[PDB]
Amino acid sequence: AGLRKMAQPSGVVEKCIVRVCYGNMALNGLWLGDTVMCPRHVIASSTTSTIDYDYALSVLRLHNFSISSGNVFLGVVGVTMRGALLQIKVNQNNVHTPKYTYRTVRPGESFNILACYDGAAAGVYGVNMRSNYTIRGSFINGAAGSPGYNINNGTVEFCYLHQLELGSGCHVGSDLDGVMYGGYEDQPTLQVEGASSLFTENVLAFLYAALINGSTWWLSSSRIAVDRFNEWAVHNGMTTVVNTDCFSIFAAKTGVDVQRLLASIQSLHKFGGKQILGYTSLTDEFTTGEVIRQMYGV
C-alpha cells in the first residue's frame, strides 16, 4: 500500500555524467560512447545578456574545455552545434555507456531527473511534463545538463537535458535532439510559460490509487459523462479525456467507474480541510503506469 512519487534507480545513468567547463562557465554533460552532450550556453561569454551562439562557437578555444569524469579528464576532438546542445567529440569511449535511446516526451508523461552539479549526481526525483512544457524541479545555478531519463527493459531512454529556469521558477530543458521543450529560448529573456492545465487522466490515476489505498470519503455516488466533463474542464484548468479505457484495469479492481471519479474531480477542484493520501489539492504528477507499478508490481 501507499503511493509515492518515485524515481527509477539511477546507477546506470550516474556513470554517464561529466563536468563540462569553459571559461567562467561550468555545467554538466552526458558522456555516451565518444560524445559528450551539454547545453550550448557553457560556451557563452555571458549568460546575463543575449547570446549569438554561432559567433561563440566560431571563436571556441578547443583547449579551453575541461571535461572530466571524476578525476579522469577527456580530450576534446571536436564540437558541433546540435540545436540547444553542443555535441562534443572526445578522445575516449565511455566503457560504461548503457544501452540507450532518445525520445521526446509529451505533456503528461513521467520521467526521472538526475540532478547534477560539478559533474556528479546529487539527487534523483520523478517529474511529469506539464502542458506548458515545463517541469516542477529543484535546480540551482550549476544544474544545466542534468539528464532526464526513463528505463525500460535495461535500455535507458534519455528525454531531457536541463537548460534554464523561467522568471516564474518553472524549469525548462531540451530533448537530446537539441529541441527545447515548449519552444522556449535558451536566452536570458522575459519569456513566460503558458497557462498550465491539470492532466485529467493523471488525476484519475491518483484517485484510483486513493481508492485502492482505502481513501473513499470524496467518492461521489453522482456520475457524469466524459462529454459534460470536458465542457466543464476547459473553464476550470483541466485537460480532456479520450482514453477512458486505460482505466478498465482500475475499474475492475475497485468497482468504481470513471464517470464517478469525474464527478468527484469537479467537487475536489478547489477538499474541505480533509486530505487524499496526504494531498490537500488534486495532483496530476502520477500516470496510470506509475500507479499500476506501485499497486501491483507489473
Partner 1 sequence: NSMLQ
Site for partner 1 in 269-298 (CB under 8 A): none
Rounded Cα distance between 253 and 159, Å, is 33
**How far apart (Å, rounded) are the C-alpha atoms in residues 208 and 202?**
10
Residues with Cβ within 8 Å of residue 275, at least 6 apart in sequence: none
Cα torsion angle, 271, 209, 154, 176, sign: negative
According to the binding rule CB under 8 A, does residue 78 interact with partner 1? no
Stretch that binds partner 1, among 39-47, 60-68, 124-132, 276-284 (CB under 8 A): 39-47
- To partner 1, the closest distance from the beta carbon of 41 in angstroms equals 5
> CA 79, CA 73: separation in Å to the nearest integer?
16
Instruction: Specify the residue, 4 or 228, whose C-beta has the smaller distance to a copy of itself.
Output: 4
State how far the alpha carbon of 198 is from the alpha carbons of 40, 77, 117, in Å.
Answer: 32, 45, 31
Single out the residue of 7, 14, 47, 271 in contact with partner 1 (rule: CB under 8 A): 47
Q: Which amino acid is at 174?
A: S
Q: With respect to partner 1, which residue has the nearer C-beta, 70 or 167?
A: 167
From residue 149 to residue 178, what is the string marking binding to partner 1 with x (rule CB under 8 A)?
Answer: -------------xxxxxx-----------
Cell reading at 116: 547534477
| Using rule CB under 8 A, residue 181 touches partner 1 | no
266 sits near partner 1 (criterion: CB under 8 A): no
- The footprint of a copy of itself (CB under 8 A) covers 1-12, 14-15, 114-115, 117, 121-125, 136-140, 142, 165, 169, 171, 213-214, 271-275, 278-281, 293-297
- Is 83 an interacting residue with respect to partner 1 (CB under 8 A)? no
Longest dimension (CA), the chain: 69
